[PDB]
Amino acid sequence: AYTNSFTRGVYYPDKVFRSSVLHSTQDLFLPFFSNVTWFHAIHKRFDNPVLPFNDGVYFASTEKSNIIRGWIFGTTLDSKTQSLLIVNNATNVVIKVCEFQFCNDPFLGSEFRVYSSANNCTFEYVSKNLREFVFKNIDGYFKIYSKHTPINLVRDLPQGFSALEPLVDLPIGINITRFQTLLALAYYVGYLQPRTFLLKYNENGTITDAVDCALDPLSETKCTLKSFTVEKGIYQTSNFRVQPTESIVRFPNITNLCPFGEVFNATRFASVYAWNRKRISNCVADYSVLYNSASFSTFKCYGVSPTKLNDLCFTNVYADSFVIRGDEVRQIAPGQTGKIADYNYKLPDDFTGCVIAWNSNNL
Amino acid sequence: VDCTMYICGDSTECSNLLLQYGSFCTQLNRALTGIAVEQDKNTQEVFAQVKQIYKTPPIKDFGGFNFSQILPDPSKPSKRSFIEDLLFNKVTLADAAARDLICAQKFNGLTVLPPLLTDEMIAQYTSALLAGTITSGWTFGAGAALQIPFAMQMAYRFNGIGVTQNVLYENQKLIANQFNSAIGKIQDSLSSTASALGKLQDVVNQNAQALNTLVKQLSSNFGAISSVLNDILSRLDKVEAEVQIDRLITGRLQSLQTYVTQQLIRAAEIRASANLAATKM
Amino acid sequence: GKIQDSLSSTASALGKLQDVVNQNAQALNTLVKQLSSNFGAISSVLNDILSRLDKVEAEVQIDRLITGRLQSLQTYVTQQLIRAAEIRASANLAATKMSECVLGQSKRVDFCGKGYHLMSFPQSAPHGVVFLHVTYIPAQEKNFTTAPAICHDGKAHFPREGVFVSNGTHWFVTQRNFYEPQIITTDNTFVSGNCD
Amino acid sequence: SECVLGQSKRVDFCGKGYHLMSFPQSAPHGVVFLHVTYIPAQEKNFTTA
Amino acid sequence: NFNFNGLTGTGVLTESNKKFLPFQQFGRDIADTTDAVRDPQTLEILDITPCSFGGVSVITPGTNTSNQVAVLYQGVNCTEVPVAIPTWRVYSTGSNVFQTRAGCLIGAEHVNNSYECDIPIGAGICASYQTSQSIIAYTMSLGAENSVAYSNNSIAIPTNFTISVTTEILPVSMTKTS
Amino acid sequence: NFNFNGLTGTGVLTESNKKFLPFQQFGRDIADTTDAVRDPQTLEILDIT
Ligand SMILES: *[C@@H]1O[C@H](CO[C@@H]2O[C@@H](C)[C@@H](O)[C@@H](O)[C@@H]2O)[C@@H](O[C@@H]2O[C@H](CO)[C@@H](O)[C@H](O)[C@H]2NC(C)=O)[C@H](O)[C@H]1NC(C)=O
Ligand SMILES: *[C@@H]1O[C@H](CO)[C@@H](O[C@@H]2O[C@H](CO)[C@@H](O)[C@H](O)[C@H]2NC(C)=O)[C@H](O)[C@H]1NC(C)=O
Ligand SMILES: *[C@@H]1O[C@H](CO)[C@@H](O[C@@H]2O[C@H](CO)[C@@H](O)[C@H](O)[C@H]2NC(C)=O)[C@H](O)[C@H]1NC(C)=O
Ligand SMILES: *[C@@H]1O[C@H](CO)[C@@H](O[C@@H]2O[C@H](CO)[C@@H](O)[C@H](O)[C@H]2NC(C)=O)[C@H](O)[C@H]1NC(C)=O
Ligand SMILES: *[C@@H]1O[C@H](CO)[C@@H](O[C@@H]2O[C@H](CO)[C@@H](O)[C@H](O)[C@H]2NC(C)=O)[C@H](O)[C@H]1NC(C)=O
Ligand SMILES: *[C@@H]1O[C@H](CO)[C@@H](O[C@@H]2O[C@H](CO)[C@@H](O)[C@H](O)[C@H]2NC(C)=O)[C@H](O)[C@H]1NC(C)=O
Ligand SMILES: *[C@@H]1O[C@H](CO)[C@@H](O[C@@H]2O[C@H](CO)[C@@H](O)[C@H](O)[C@H]2NC(C)=O)[C@H](O)[C@H]1NC(C)=O
Ligand SMILES: *[C@@H]1O[C@H](CO)[C@@H](O[C@@H]2O[C@H](CO)[C@@H](O)[C@H](O)[C@H]2NC(C)=O)[C@H](O)[C@H]1NC(C)=O
Ligand SMILES: *[C@@H]1O[C@H](CO)[C@@H](O[C@@H]2O[C@H](CO)[C@@H](O)[C@H](O)[C@H]2NC(C)=O)[C@H](O)[C@H]1NC(C)=O
Ligand SMILES: *[C@@H]1O[C@H](CO)[C@@H](O)[C@H](O)[C@H]1NC(C)=O
Ligand SMILES: *[C@@H]1O[C@H](CO)[C@@H](O)[C@H](O)[C@H]1NC(C)=O
Ligand SMILES: *[C@@H]1O[C@H](CO)[C@@H](O)[C@H](O)[C@H]1NC(C)=O
Ligand SMILES: *[C@@H]1O[C@H](CO)[C@@H](O)[C@H](O)[C@H]1NC(C)=O
Ligand SMILES: *[C@@H]1O[C@H](CO)[C@@H](O)[C@H](O)[C@H]1NC(C)=O
Ligand SMILES: *[C@@H]1O[C@H](CO)[C@@H](O)[C@H](O)[C@H]1NC(C)=O
């Protein structure tokens, strides 16, 4: 089942007091009038399976008997990784981050049947109705916002505006990609997206209104004018710009593999005063084989990234090889000087190649 | 000119860096927007000085004065006068290659907005002003168009210069013949040489020169390993690409700041010319 | 009375003065907000850098802020110098209208409002001046037959001032800008030449 | 054009008082106008109707 | 997106009429963008022009009056607007689409009446919120059209007058920042 | 000079009437520039004038 998020899910983006002002912020928000999923848990739809977490979750409950009691968050949910438990028991809110082996169908009831075991626990804390929440993992923390509000309704998420205040800021490093609700023997889930919001702060510094700057052209005018009221006119809000339908790749259709093997694994190298040069051309290369070889003590590229080197084409390539002292490798760079750089092998100031060197004391 | 689309083209990577310079691109877009709206205001205050679109009568007995070169030509879709065609041609023989260049150069985020009033509308206002004058004297300026015979309008004009009006009426045929010949010399002069209209063709050449400079500034390196920003994105990983891109951003942004500053100054020069043209009207 | 009522009611009349306030306040706010821009430094709060980095690295980050903040002042002052030139032009115009419309009566058409100028009264406004241009507008025109001259006794008579008009049976002379007919008379006409 | 080549009725354009005539004088990077003007003086009161 | 021999960009690859000489590989724009390219496998020549773009200018009455708006996609043809932009496809699917010379106008009702220019658009087009209200778009009327009734012996003379008072406003100063 | 929770600068600390919300630690002017701070021990609000 589904329903519409009537401007719900705004939250105070940072711990800074502001008043009598309109402020633009870019953050993960629930887009206005989003298509949110609706669930009918009661002590009827009891199954209430695991859900993805994505970039972050908005959660709300319409309730009368405190049936909804918490959530678990994690990836594998099977003790092969750490996971986060949040639960509100009859006397305390409890938060723990352990390698939980959760039950196949976690519930409360006199009963607590959430997990079979917990180990390697690295964080713990112990502390008619609409209850609203937002959950984020960001910048090395797990962050939670909430508000509770009185209602009188039989079904569906109510209208009107209410900004969620920050609740807790857990310094926990775990990965999260899925979550599931914990229930005691209706709720709504929405997903956050990166959005630009204009927030209206009253004289007491509460957020009393917001504009989702992307929602529609009028909202974008409001946002680009930094004003909730817009006078009659024509306003140059934005750029229309057609996105690419697909990506076309057209490299040359040459099948001949480049003979890099015979320059790196040669039996005898040339004397540096008479450094050898081999032209590499009319062939297809695979620089990833060289870079990932891990056999080289030094691998320095100038004007070309080693990883992107495999995603590029060249008109010609020249492989130069020679042997020098380990202390002389530092001279094989653009703009260098010394007996080797001055009298044996000089690189140009604007060199565009790569320098690769390895210890050969075995040969 | 869109500041972000000029500086970064398609690149999202460059666009994210350009946000760290903050407001500069919003200032440049907004300054050019002001200049653009100024041009309609300049046109409005020169030509929309007449409240009503006055018409000449079909029976054009103006006492021997022959305005046929300067009154609208009904045979044409734009319905310019004959002299307004000679004017329109000699400047559009420049431009009004630059448009075609700018259209080719549009790939770099240039755009040219149409004016609010078309050539047809401006010629419709000059028609109303001219038809008002010859039929009603200065009176259509001060208020309602009070018709008066043109021979007697011209006799008022003579009193204004301190020549008694009988000098008009006793020499009206000579005075009309002199006028008709002088209008002929105007027609010949504009048909003969474009060089009279140099003031209009110069502002066209200056705006064309400013954009062709602004386009060529994309070809600069500003010290970056390539002028073509897509090369860097194809060739360096982010930690090194950012240093190269930031050189292009800096130099391309200073190219816009120079252009927008000089166009703000030219906008004041043209507005001073428009204020004069409005006062002459 | 209509001036008082209009200024009491419409918002758009004083647009030029409010706009000048808007543009200058907007420029200041924009100049302040450019202090929050990083220009590639690790922070735009300059005290962060000097607490967080050692000197020879800090100088690299600080010089980015100095470059971008100096570029922000050059942008502000450049645009204020251009705006100052615009205000100078309005000030020279307002001074000329004080000279010619207030201290005088201007023959210049549409310079001191629509209609023929009678007089103007200056009123001060925030950062500006308001001229109440009092003007005469011809109204309720009637049509007449007219002629350049009267032929009498074989000689042509022309008006000394005004214009000849006929109501269809009688010929009169009258002033051009207000119908007050008078008998065509040797006192208000002058002769020149024969009628032919 | 207006003060030297003509007589200007434009108040306070060609100096104070009623403009009679003006003389141009050259100066470094500029021009100097000597505006000659009639200023009325020694007024007396009268009854009027 | 295209990537020829590593030369990478975005555009609408098109069969070129431009006759490259047999050795030539790229064709260049004055700004060093790629004007044309040779396919490395068929050796055919392709024109490249960029995917279209333009200013989204949003036309609105005051929010005090209405939340209706119209959108002018400046400089782009209406047949190309609906696909992409940050996305409001429900506008492009509306019944109101109208090709001005300024660009595609969406969400305004074109009418054949003419009025004074309320909101300017360009090329003689203006738009207004009018009646059941909608944003209409129309060619602006320059003024009432009048025949002066001239004749070689007719004069009009005012029998009366109006004393008019006209407010003119001029800026004189701006705030003395330092 | 002041350091509040790392917020380092110079100003005239003044007793505020601006009612921070309980979670808020700092306060800013309309310009998004620092204007007040919550003392981390007394929890009172100071105008950083
Ligand atoms: C002024 O008169 C014109 C027509 O002039 C006629 O000849 C004059 C010498 C005098 O004898 C007038 O009484 C005559 O009528 C009027 O023009 C008409 O205006 C109406 C619109 O109001 C228009 O529909 C007609 O086509 C016009 N007629 C012509 C021939 O152009 C005009 O209305 C008169 N104005 C006033 C204020 O009385
Ligand atoms: C967090 O966990 C998710 C799995 O739930 C990881 O996502 C996978 O990442 C690899 C690449 O490293 C992909 O091949 C898989 O397809 C991804 N799986 C899903 C379901 O997206 C993610 O990498 C983890 N992140 C960290 C930082 O550990
Ligand atoms: C809710 O959970 C908390 C633990 O997080 C329980 O509190 C503990 O209760 C036991 C007695 O059963 C005490 O010995 C502990 O000292 C308590 N710990 C804390 C931190 O207070 C609480 O009892 C639970 N509620 C219910 C109803 O079982
Ligand atoms: C608690 O965590 C540690 C690692 O942090 C787990 O140690 C691993 O144990 C398995 C055997 O069960 C070994 O194969 C791994 O190599 C160990 N990892 C490391 C890094 O030493 C430990 O098993 C966890 N405790 C429980 C009860 O599972
Ligand atoms: C902001 O807070 C003030 C108090 O700090 C509120 O003022 C009170 O408002 C109620 C009515 O709701 C009055 O009965 C009180 O007398 C007011 N107190 C004072 C000291 O004036 C004000 O309503 C709040 N406003 C908002 C928008 O939150
Ligand atoms: C008014 O001037 C026009 C020219 O603009 C005259 O029209 C020309 O008349 C001659 C015949 O005498 C033709 O050979 C030309 O082709 C006409 N030119 C145009 C453009 O029509 C017109 O005859 C003049 N009328 C009066 C009364 O002087
Ligand atoms: C004033 O000058 C005009 C010329 O501008 C004279 O008019 C010419 O007179 C001769 C006859 O003497 C004619 O052949 C020409 O065709 C006339 N020219 C025009 C344009 O009509 C006029 O005669 C002069 N009058 C006096 C008193 O000197
Ligand atoms: C034109 O004006 C003359 C005035 O000079 C009018 O003559 C008067 O006409 C009325 C009758 O309508 C007589 O009672 C007066 O005695 C006449 N006065 C004179 C001096 O003759 C004349 O009627 C007017 N004609 C029109 C058509 O308006
Ligand atoms: C707007 O786009 C349409 C096509 O999407 C153009 O219409 C076509 O124009 C060509 C000539 O260029 C004709 O051969 C086709 O028959 C037209 N097709 C249709 C369906 O009308 C239209 O000309 C474009 N207009 C502008 C101003 O760019
Ligand atoms: C919400 O989206 C789902 C698909 O993700 C769709 O099945 C459902 O119909 C949408 N909601 C409504 C009310 O249509
Ligand atoms: C050199 O030989 C080793 C195997 O002995 C091989 O792994 C390596 O790829 C060869 N070098 C190159 C450049 O391929
Ligand atoms: C690539 O294949 C085409 C046929 O699809 C062939 O004509 C062409 O010669 C090939 N490329 C080269 C470099 O030979
Ligand atoms: C809004 O409209 C009302 C009239 O309905 C008017 O009184 C009010 O001043 C208007 N406000 C604005 C900001 O236009
Ligand atoms: C507008 O006028 C044209 C003719 O100029 C006509 O073809 C068209 O149907 C009219 N449209 C409407 C909506 O009346
Ligand atoms: C810090 O000290 C103040 C007294 O100066 C006291 O009121 C406050 O409670 C203390 N902080 C905590 C966390 O107890």
Residue numbers in the entry:
A (entry chain B): 27 to 69, 77 to 142, 155 to 172, 187 to 244, 264 to 441
B (entry chain C): 736 to 831, 845 to 1029
C (entry chain B): 932 to 1127
D (entry chain A): 1030 to 1078
E (entry chain B): 540 to 624, 631 to 676, 689 to 735
F (entry chain A): 540 to 588
Question: What text does the study give?
Answer:
S glycoprotein trimers protrude out from the viral membrane and are the major proteins on the viral surface, making it the main target for vaccine design. Sequential cleavage of S at the S1/S2 site followed by the S2’ site within the S2 domain exposes the fusion peptide (FP), which mediates host-viral membrane fusion, allowing entry of the viral genome into the host cell. Overall, the S-trimer structures are similar to those previously determined for B.1 in situ, and are similar across all variants.
In the B.1 S trimer, upon opening of the RBD in chain A to make the receptor binding site accessible, we observe an outwards movement (~5.7 Å) in the 570 hairpin. The directly neighboring residues 852–855 from chain B are in the β-strand conformation seen in the closed Alpha, but K854 has not rotated and continues to face the 630 loop. Instead, residue F855, which packs against the outside of P589 in the closed B.1 and the inside of P589 in the closed Alpha, rotates towards chain A residues 568–572. On the opposite side of the trimer, chain A residues 855–858 have also transitioned to the β-strand conformation, F855 packs against the inner surface of P589, and the adjacent K854 rotates towards the 570 hairpin. This is very similar to the conformation seen in the closed Alpha, but whereas in the closed Alpha K854 appears to interact with the variant A570D, at this position in the open B.1, the 570 hairpin from chain C is still in its closed position and K854 appears to interact with D568. The end of the FPPR of chain B remains in the helical conformation seen in the closed state, while the 630 loop of chain A, adjacent to 852–855 from chain B, is largely unfolded. In contrast, the 630 loop of chain C, adjacent to 852–855 from chain A, is folded. We can only speculate as to the functional relevance of these transitions, but suggest that the proximity of K854 and D568 at a position opposite the raised RBD may both stabilize the folding of the 630 loop and modulate the position of the 570 hairpin, either hindering opening of the chain C RBD or favoring it.
